[PDB]
Design a protein around this nucleic acid. Sequence first.
DNA 1: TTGACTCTCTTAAGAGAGTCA
DNA 2: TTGACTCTCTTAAGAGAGTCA
Lengths: 162, 162
Amino acid sequence: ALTNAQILAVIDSWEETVGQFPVITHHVPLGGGLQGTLHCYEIPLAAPYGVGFAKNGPTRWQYKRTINQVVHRWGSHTVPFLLEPDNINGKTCTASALCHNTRCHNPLHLCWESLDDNKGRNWCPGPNGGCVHAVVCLRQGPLYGPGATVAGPQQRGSHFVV
Amino acid sequence: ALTNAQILAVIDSWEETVGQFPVITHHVPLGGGLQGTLHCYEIPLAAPYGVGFAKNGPTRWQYKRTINQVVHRWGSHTVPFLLEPDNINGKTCTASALCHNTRCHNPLHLCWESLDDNKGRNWCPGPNGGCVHAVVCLRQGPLYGPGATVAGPQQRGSHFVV
DNA sequence: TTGACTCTCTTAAGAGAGTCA
DNA sequence: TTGACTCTCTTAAGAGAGTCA
Ligand code: NA
Ligand code: NA
Ligand SMILES: [Zn+2]
Ligand SMILES: [Zn+2]
Ligand SMILES: [Zn+2]
Ligand SMILES: [Zn+2]
């Protein structure tokens, strides 16, 4: 809600509930042929999910609290960042899952950045493979690699140059 | 159904028309602090665009040919790949602009790959900065870099471990 | 046969808000 | 107040199809 005290209360309440979510260990590529371990705090697959949480889509949830008899609701991954600017360079700030695990709500696996930065982490080589993100990646992106291109650049005639 | 000859004729007509688009020289980052040159053949900003071309959206165009009284239409960037498979690994193949210049229709600047591979090139370090794309990038992606993250992973209490 | 417009849809990273009990 | 559902929207890389003359 409006007051700093109320916001801190929201963050602390959210952390307590998510702190009780099942902790699941995931072993992950770091880049450079190295492997690491992440501990994700995963929201349940079906109701009940936890105090204040409800599912609004297959892998979308919201956190709800009643303050001053008014209902305040936020995207379930956004709560750690309620005290942060909600935009940057004219772009909306988004909750960005460093572990690439949508059910995870571990705030140590989340950052707050533009949707472009967020998406781009899917192709990052990872913290031991050359990641240059200022807020460093926790793992190599799931989509990093040579790709599966069907056809490359080509022309039939002689009208074009690179 | 259009024959291979008819399809080849469509590709030849497209190349002949696009080859007359204005050719614009762009200096671009290659990665590794190096600079290169790309020559883009750019569709005009407003009508007329060229024989067979029409704008269906702000930066979307289609190419149309009528053959034996039947109207055929294709996405304007897809024509170089009409003789290629149209899906791979169960994913639709898409025209992927290696020059990251949407108005460009230079077929030497296009490849044919899944939408995920396509998008991921936005963050590639480039052909001289460590690109691992099997069909190599022509330049460093416009979104490669440290990013502009507003807040990193953090907790208020002690409920979480990484 | 052709040009110049119109509209809506896909994907996978993200969101807001309403209806009931 | 709290829980468990419903619906649609945003972005930036990509698409298909209709109307009229
Ligand atoms: Na993400
Ligand atoms: Na692209
Ligand atoms: Zn996680
Ligand atoms: Zn990274
Ligand atoms: Zn180009
Ligand atoms: Zn590349």
